[PDB]
Give the backbone structure.
Amino acid sequence: GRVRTKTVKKAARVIIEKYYTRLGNDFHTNKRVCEEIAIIPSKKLRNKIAGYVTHLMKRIQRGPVRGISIKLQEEERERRDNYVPEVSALDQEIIEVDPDTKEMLKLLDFGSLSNLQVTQPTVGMNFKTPRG
Amino acid sequence: DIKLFGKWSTDDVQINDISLQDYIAVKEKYAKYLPHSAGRYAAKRFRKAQCPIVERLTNSMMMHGRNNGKKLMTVRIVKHAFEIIHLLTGENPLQVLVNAIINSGPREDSTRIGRAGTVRRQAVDVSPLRRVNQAIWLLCTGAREAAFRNIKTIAECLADELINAAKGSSNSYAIKKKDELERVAKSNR
Amino acid sequence: PIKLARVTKVLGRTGSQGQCTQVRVEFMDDTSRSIIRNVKGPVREGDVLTLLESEREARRL
Amino acid sequence: QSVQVFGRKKTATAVAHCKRGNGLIKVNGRPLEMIEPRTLQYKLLEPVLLLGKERFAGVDIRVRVKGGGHVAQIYAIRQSISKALVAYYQKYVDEASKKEIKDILIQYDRTLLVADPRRCESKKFGGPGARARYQKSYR
Amino acid sequence: PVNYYVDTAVRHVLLRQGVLGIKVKIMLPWDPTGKIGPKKPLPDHVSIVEPKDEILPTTPISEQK
Amino acid sequence: TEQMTLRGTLKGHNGWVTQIATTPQFPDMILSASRDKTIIMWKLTRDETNYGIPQRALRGHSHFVSDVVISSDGQFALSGSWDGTLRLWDLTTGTTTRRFVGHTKDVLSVAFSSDNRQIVSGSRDKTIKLWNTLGVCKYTVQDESHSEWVSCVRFSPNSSNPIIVSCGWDKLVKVWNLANCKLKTNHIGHTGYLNTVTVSPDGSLCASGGKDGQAMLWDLNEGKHLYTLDGGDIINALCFSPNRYWLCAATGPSIKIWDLEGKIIVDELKQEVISTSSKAEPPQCTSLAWSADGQTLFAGYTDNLVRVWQVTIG
RNA sequence: AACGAGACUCUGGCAUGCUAACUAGUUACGCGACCGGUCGGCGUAACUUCUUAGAGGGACAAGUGGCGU
């Protein structure tokens, strides 16, 4: 079995969340950026961090991960969040309303609404699941 | 072309069974000069199937405690055993060896299933690889039992074992023990 | 008579000590029929078995 | 001129020196035909039989062998010769025949150009050898 | 890492009824380039340098020193 | 109407083709440095089977070969590799002559002089160096060098104004002078680290590329930013056309060509016939090199093949 | 969060790249013996492939194809 450990996984997550700009997809370059910055003991421990970094950067292209937080990714997700269509989903020419809701609006002095259209309710009073 | 020991060609040999055709390595990329390659076929699973069948024969003959590393003696045992068969049958010793391997393997076997005590064995199939391995085992076991305390030199008792098996004859240790083995497995159907 | 069937997939390991393997095999003639069989030895997909009795279907060992 | 290339089984180390010549192959100043174990004679003959006598026609290879055993030393010679002829090309002919010979050699046998890395495991106390243990007594 | 990060001592004290054994183990701090403690860090401790904050430019400017 | 079609590929490496070099004195010879510690000379046959085949293999280094260059006389070749070394070859016998030591980390770039008598190399040391052709260093450039790796440094083809152009991961463009080490202009305005810088043949403009994908062209004379061009992906290499005043850049797996007079694209170079590999990224384009004439374009790839493109005259 | 596991130390496998060698050799050239060949016969200069041992590299499930909420 070839399973990493919390030491290498934690160190790699920290490196990725702190130095996203310089890290990339290439292993042999991420191996050389880790030695420049992090004070790591010998090559065997250096490589297992810089390999999981390369593995874990591919997942970022697929989308965000529940372990790291890049403010550049925050900006990208905010650009995604600041999305509104030109025509909203709540402005409709016609709104379908039940006969029972129409009476509630009548009690709400909203009987002059012109976008409404009273529809025929379902007749069979069968809305329960069979028992057994 | 590259022929065994410089005098036994390979391109004329044909494997009959489609079942063991890919588990016997004799013809195109396995055509070697000697049954000696310092191979590493025992590192991963199913790698031994790529071992030449003549070299597979060579190993199983250096068995019992006094011979476990004396491979050069077994290379000449096989070398002399191939030049004797060709004098009797007149055919290719490689073809004789292949036909002996095909004939002497069991095709059905029995496996212990009942709890300890009374034996309730079932009937199961046999892998092609195990069939090849067990054919080699039986052929090498019959060669050294028939020569243990005889004036007959070994590589003459091996030749006689291989001749009688390519004919499917009952004068052969491997055929005798293959027939007794599928007999019991049919009883357990 | 003797039938030849081709291993299509390996299901698992059965036997008192795990010495046998479940396979499903597809016949060469009338290839539409596939049955469950037990084998002994190393088996991988693509191996072709020689069935002497070709009516039985396998069960747990 | 010349190249010097080694081959290496377990502890044996053969060194082959190749220069401009007329077809002399000699190990320890002795003909290749009569290296002491004649049973493994074809292993020494495999490179020249695979390539052909016409490639070892402008090259003169002399081999010096030391260490190990008989069988390891024979295996250290067939690799040394093969590596030295590959090294003689791609330096004195072109990068076109080196590829041809390297391919022809490596399809037949990878140990003709790559060394087997296996070496003896150390003995461990409590057993005759690396893995075998002493017989354990009960009652 | 135990051969240089710890210091061990075993001593005997003879009382009226017998002998008592006293064992003392001390695990030292790091102290880089220091008299006390090993200069080598623990083999599992990874120190990641905090980057110097910088402002990425918005418009191009040439500095013609 | 001026497009480019795949004329063929050269194979023979086992690692990323890192750099390609061409010479005007030998039209039938190019050099390829790759990430397998070997430099290959190519003999171009231009036959039906394959475009060219390797002729010499320079086996001197013990790590990735990062850059190679050819002297004006087509007999010498200067290399810089990742073990830390700058090696001088002899393309007649293919054996090294001088070894150039002194950098403490991996030497990233190489540049050999126009008058063939001075060398500049940049490394991970954050220190640029000047060298003589005998194997000695004249200046070490420690006083206000790049605070990060020197990604690439190279000379200019003008004897009027001795200039060397340096590149770095500190997101800055440096301009220097010969006979000294004085800084002239610290060009600011690059986001992300930089990878390649190239000097125009006239010696008045230079182009640099980096991770942002934006390739800015800076006036080597009058020292002001003049162009900024948008390549969608990261730029790994840049190059200038010898005579047709074009700009070429390897943006990821594509190659964009800019007229620099129309300020617009001219052709996109990418082979996308393969569609089976629907889960792996396409191989990237590492380096570029134009022929002496100006009608051939060799591109190295992470695929580890070299691809040749021809300028359709018709 | 901590100890234990892992990491760590020693060892084996690779480097025609680096630093070195009369208490290690190789190649070449002479002198010599014998029938261009052999010489662990003898002496000089080319250097480090072989021997020795220091530094630094090199392997990380890293690349591809499958399986896996």
